[PDB]
């Protein structure tokens, strides 16, 4: 539900700031009467082998962080595509949501303080990105608890917890490939980005200009937020949907300003990885009772057309011999058409027969010969042969 | 004056004349829409705020164009095509522009903590994922004393992902840093006056190897210029290269400074080889960390070498229950009672000694020299107690307790000058000579190819631990115009000789009787990475295969090879009857457990060893140097060649040193233990008897029928024997 005038979102935003503000002092004045005036260190690697995921131990809290922050969003897709109002009156006691959330809260406030630990120096630390993500999180949760009722404020920023995912995927040793490793980085940045985006357009929407008293207010949904900043980022800004609240345009503008730069690069790196894969992969299917040929070496559209106009000619004896090329490139455009053409006797497989595997996948022990053809046409014979 | 950087300069004028553009513009667009269009007295007109406009601007220059607003007076309409026409190139350039220029920000700066008692190494030179894997992988091993130390790299790069995603696997332990040795700035972030060391990788693929060893001793200069008192470790891939560091004031070998020079030390090992055939495998096992791990789908003889594997050299100090024992009687109880190899110790200024008689004793706190499984095993040879506590039955229950001429240092067999041409044979010649039981170097090079340092193939086996009687001759077969080049440093050795030609020719090979030689080495000064990784070792492999392939008449694959490879993975072409995985890791491989295959990688974990027990990295030395000591390198280093002559008996007594044997189990006193004896009988008989101290075995792999033998380094005491083993040995005779 919600309650007429009586705004209290002021309660839960100080609450942000007097945790990140009252630590970031004692953090000052500490630093302060040690620059004028053991267990530590042990406790320091202990908790950092421990976030790395080195000890199993480890493991476990570094798979929890992953399924735990996946969660956290979930819950928070929940609340802001089901209360209508940006704060809402309503009893803890009775939400299954917001009770569920307090669990994962005290997960990530558990999470933060050994991360404190670990942390070579505390005041870059109190200041790293995840940090503020606690900050605007959790103690915001916990008014929630004091008070009978919610504010949907900073609670979108749990969608870059996301952009912790590569390092856990690190920690965890399974992004092996260098590709493998920017892909998931690129895409999962892309998309916690986005959301983090739409979800604070749907604050400044839904809430209203402060300075025109909350009036100047429009009641977009998360989801029309995210559909409209996937439609500006792009560039089509079809209109259909637009800011209004002077705070939502200049965060529009800001936006543009960053966001297309973003897409514009995203979408071209994400198409040259997947168009990255290998075509003629896999093994030659050896038939029943057919010879095969492998031939490798010079293998291109004039040294096949030349080699298999001879070696298919109507002419011969019509011995059913399929060819199986084996060679590194991938074909041209030419040599696709014409393997194309012959596909019922010719194939084709990306590989080498310097590689024991390539010469298995070929099944060449059950080969009748493998042809090695030359480049007559080299540089240099001596290094051809 | 304060836009100083050229970047600063650009970034400055981008963004202000940006910024002024879309203001003005916006507010151009604001003087005629609220106007209204003159010739239509000013009625057509909208009321949008500047900030409306400033807004629609950046809407429209974007091209996202919403038309929530939209300009309709005709002067605002025909402005709105001008602004389209200019200022969408102005936003499509300044955005990737400025992209770029906060994108240029150097990622890895700032400064090492140093933490409250931590060690740190310092690591620079060439890194890599591949030499930083190779490197912490030996470095932070799980069978090591676990002592803390911090791995500080700094380099010139960024590191490429697989780096980074290492980098935050070991955040705990590893640090990097952006930045040089050149620079005293940087010395100065990395603490490099409180490190432990510094560590100089090498670029061992480089086009180059002198350019290479140049940027290497530059760092070393800068280090060291730094402060002088940093040890200093230095990947060398030039022998000769030695000579410039060793010319560094600072430089100094008891502070613990050193070159680990992979020329050097390649050459000894194959050396080694020539006396002792497996050898290379034996010892270059020793020195990397690896552990025992078997699977079912291993054949018998794959266990018994793979746990040889498991060894390595460990030091510890000898418990005080050791003194006064003759070293004989040390390693007699060591072996026998402990389970341990005792082969080395540190006699007290101090000095290694390897298998010493029973003229020297033990004394309180003697550091000894152990093969062992693990660290954890040597240190069983400290908390033993003898009668004094426990020191019975189960190894486990030890716990702790509490109760002719020379070189001019008489190293080398030596001979004054000559010049080539005196050593210089032909085909006919050659055949002539009677040679027999020689070694044969075949030797692929370009007359301008870099020069790989032959002495340190030819100095192994010319010791003077050795007669002259039984120095085996040697024969190059190579290019003559690249053996001019090197001949200057072989000049000294006797009993040496030069076949000019192709190794590949087999009419060299037969004028050589390459079927009467104790070995046949195969290497080549070809270009290391030249453009086909598969090309690199093909003139190795053509040489192994072509003799293999040989016959000969009053055979072929019987002849003893060995074959330095550039890439570790040729060795699958090598020989036949492998039958190996080609997935598998060179150390495995058939070639590689006979000895018939060696590679430059296997001594990267060198780097590492040297770092955490110097004095290991000085017992390897002797041993596959056959005995160069810091005067000879200094000897060397005075440019003048290597100086020789008669010797005093004062010198000449160092005649008599410790060398590696290989001692058969068909005939002589030891027979009756290949007869189906064990090992520890054989061991502990032979180092009673004899002194000769027994370090492991090289047995036939088809005991049934090739002529392949395998290394089981330092086996069980309870290890049956067969009368066709071969022992590899540490004698005095």
Same mark, same amino acid.
């Given at each position: ?39 530590? $260190? ?39 595509? $089901? ?13 299954? $949501? ?288 | ?733």
């Amino acid at each position: 539900s919600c309650e007429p005038g009586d705004r209290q979102w002021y309660s839960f935003l100080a609450s942000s700031l007097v945790t990140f503000g009252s630590g970031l002092v004692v953090i000052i004045i500490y630093r302060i009467v040690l620059w004028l005036c053991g267990w530590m $260190t042990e406790a320091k690697d202990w908790a950092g082998e421990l976030i790395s995921g080195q000890t199993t131990t480890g493991r476990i809290l570094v798979g929890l962080v992953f399924l735990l922050s996946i969660a956290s969003l979930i819950i928070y897709f929940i609340d802001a595509s $089901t209360n209508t109002s940006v704060e809402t009156c309503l009893p803890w006691s009775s939400s299954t $949501t917001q009770q569920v959330d307090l669990a994962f809260n005290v997960f990530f406030m558990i999470y933060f303080f050994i991360r404190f630990v670990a942390a070579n120096d505390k005041l870059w630390f109190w200041v790293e990105l995840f940090s503020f993500v606690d900050y605007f999180t959790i103690p915001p949760s916990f008014v929630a608890i004091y008070l009978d009722r919610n504010w949907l404020g900073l609670q979108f920023l749990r969608a870059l917890r996301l952009m912790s995912i590569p390092d856990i995927l690190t920690y965890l040793n399974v992004l092996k490939t260098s590709t493998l490793i920017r892909l998931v980085q690129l895409v999962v940045s892309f998309v916690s980005l986005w959301l983090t985006a739409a979800g604070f357009l749907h604050l400044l929407e839904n809430s209203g200009d402060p300075f025109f008293d909350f009036g100047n207010a429009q009641h977009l949904t998360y989801w029309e937020c995210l559909y409209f900043l996937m439609v500006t980022m792009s560039t089509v800004g079809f209109g259909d949907i637009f800011a209004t609240t002077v705070l939502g345009r200049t965060f529009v503008v800001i936006f543009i300003m960053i966001f297309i730069g973003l897409f514009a690069s995203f979408i071209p790196e994400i198409a040259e990885i997947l168009g990255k894969r290998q075509k003629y992969g896999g093994s030659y299917k050896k038939e029943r009772g057919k010879r095969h040929v492998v031939v490798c070496g010079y293998i291109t559209f004039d040294s096949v057309s030349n080699f298999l106009k001879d070696f298919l000619h109507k002419d011969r004896e019509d011995v059913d011999v399929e060819i199986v090329f084996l060679h590194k490139g991938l074909p041209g455009l030419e040599l696709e058409g014409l393997l194309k053409r012959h596909f019922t006797q010719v194939e084709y497989f990306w590989g080498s027969v310097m590689d024991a595997n390539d010469l298995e996948r070929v099944k060449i022990q059950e080969a009748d010969a493998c042809l090695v053809l030359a480049n007559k046409y080299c540089q240099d014979p001596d290094q051809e042969d | 004056n304060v836009l100083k950087t050229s970047t600063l300069i650009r970034l400055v004028q981008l963004v202000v004349s940006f910024v002024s553009l879309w203001l003005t513009a916006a507010g151009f667009l604001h003087l005629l829409e609220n106007s209204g269009d003159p010739f239509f007295d000013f009625g057509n007109a909208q009321h949008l705020t500047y900030w409306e406009c400033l807004y629609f601007l950046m809407v429209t220059m974007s091209t996202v164009g919403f038309g929530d607003i939209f300009a309709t007076t005709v002067l605002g309409r025909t402005f709105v095509v001008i602004f389209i026409m200019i200022f969408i190139g102005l936003f499509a350039s300044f955005i990737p522009e400025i992209a770029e220029i906060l994108g240029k920000r150097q990622k890895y700066g700032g400064s090492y903590k140093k933490e409250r008692g931590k060690r740190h190494v310092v690591v620079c030179g060439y890194i890599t994922f591949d030499s930083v894997s190779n490197f912490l992988k030996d470095f932070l091993h799980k069978d090591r004393e676990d002592v803390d130390v911090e791995i500080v790299f700094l380099h010139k790069g960024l590191p490429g992902l697989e780096l980074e995603g290492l980098l935050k696997r070991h955040f705990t332990q590893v640090e990097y840093f952006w930045g040089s040795v050149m620079d005293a700035n940087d010395l100065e972030r990395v603490k490099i006056q409180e490190a432990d060391a510094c560590l100089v990788l090498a670029n061992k693929y480089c086009q180059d190897p002198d350019q290479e060893d140049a940027a290497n001793i530059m760092r070393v200069i800068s280090i060291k210029n730094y402060h002088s008192d940093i040890k200093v470790i230095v990947q060398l891939l030039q022998y000769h290269n030695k000579a410039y560091l060793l010319n560094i004031p600072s430089w100094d070998w008891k502070r613990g400074d050193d070159a680990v020079c992979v020329a050097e030390l390649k050459l000894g090992f194959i050396a080694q080889s020539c006396l002792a055939p497996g050898f290379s495998t034996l010892m270059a096992n020793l020195f990397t960390m690896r552990s025992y791990k078997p699977t079912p789908e291993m054949s018998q003889w794959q266990t018994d070498y793979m746990r040889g594997t498991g060894m390595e050299m460990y030091t510890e100090y000898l418990s005080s229950a050791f003194n006064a024992l003759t070293f004989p009687e040390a390693a007699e109880l060591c072996f026998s009672k402990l389970k341990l190899l005792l082969l080395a110790i540190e006699v007290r200024e101090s000095t290694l000694a390897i298998n010493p008689g029973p003229k020297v004793k033990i004394e309180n706190a003697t550091q000894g020299f152990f093969i062992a499984e693990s660290a954890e095993e040597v240190k069983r040879a400290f908390y033993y107690c003898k009668n004094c506590h426990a020191n019975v039955s189960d190894v486990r229950q030890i716990k702790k307790c509490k109760c002719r001429k020379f070189d001019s240092t008489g190293m080398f067999h030596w001979c004054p000058d000559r010049p080539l041409n005196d050593c210089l044979q032909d085909r006919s010649q050659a055949s002539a000579s009677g040679l027999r039981n020689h070694v044969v170097v075949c030797l692929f090079a370009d007359a301008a190819s870099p020069l790989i340092g032959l002495r340190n193939l030819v100095m192994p086996l010319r010791a003077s631990n050795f007669h002259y009687h039984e120095l085996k001759p040697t024969i190059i077969v190579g290019n003559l115009d690249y053996l001019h080049r090197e001949w200057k440093t072989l000049q000294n050795f006797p009993k040496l000789s030069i076949l000019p030609g192709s190794p590949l020719n087999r009419a060299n090979l037969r004028a050589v009787n390459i079927n009467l030689c104790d070995m046949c080495v195969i290497v080549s000064a070809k270009d290391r990475n030249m453009e086909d990784p598969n090309l690199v070792d093909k003139e190795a492999i053509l040489c192994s295969l072509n003799i293999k392939a040989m016959t000969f008449d009053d055979a072929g694959a019987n002849v003893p090879l060995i074959t330095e490879l550039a890439n570790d993975s040729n060795v699958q072409f090598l020989d036949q009857d492998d039958d190996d995985d080609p997935d598998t890791e060179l150390y495995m491989t058939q070639p590689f457990a006979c000895g018939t295959a060696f590679a430059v990688s296997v001594l990267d974990s060198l780097m590492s060893t040297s770092y955490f027990n110097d004095n290991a990295l000085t017992l390897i030395r002797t041993l596959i140097t056959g005995g160069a000591t810091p005067e000879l390198e200094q000897i060397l280093a005075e440019g003048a060649g290597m100086r020789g002559g008669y010797c005093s008996p004062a010198v000449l007594a160092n005649r008599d040193r410790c060398r590696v044997a290989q001692i058969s189990l068909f005939d002589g006193p030891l027979a009756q233990f290949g007869q189906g004896g064990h090992y520890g009988e054989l061991f502990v008989y032979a180092l009673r008897h004899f002194g000769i101290l027994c370090i492991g075995l090289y047995r036939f792999r088809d005991t049934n029928p090739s002529s392949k033998r395998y290394v089981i380094t330092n086996p069980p005491e309870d290890f049956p024997l067969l009368p066709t083993d071969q022992v590899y040995v540490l004698t005095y005779k």
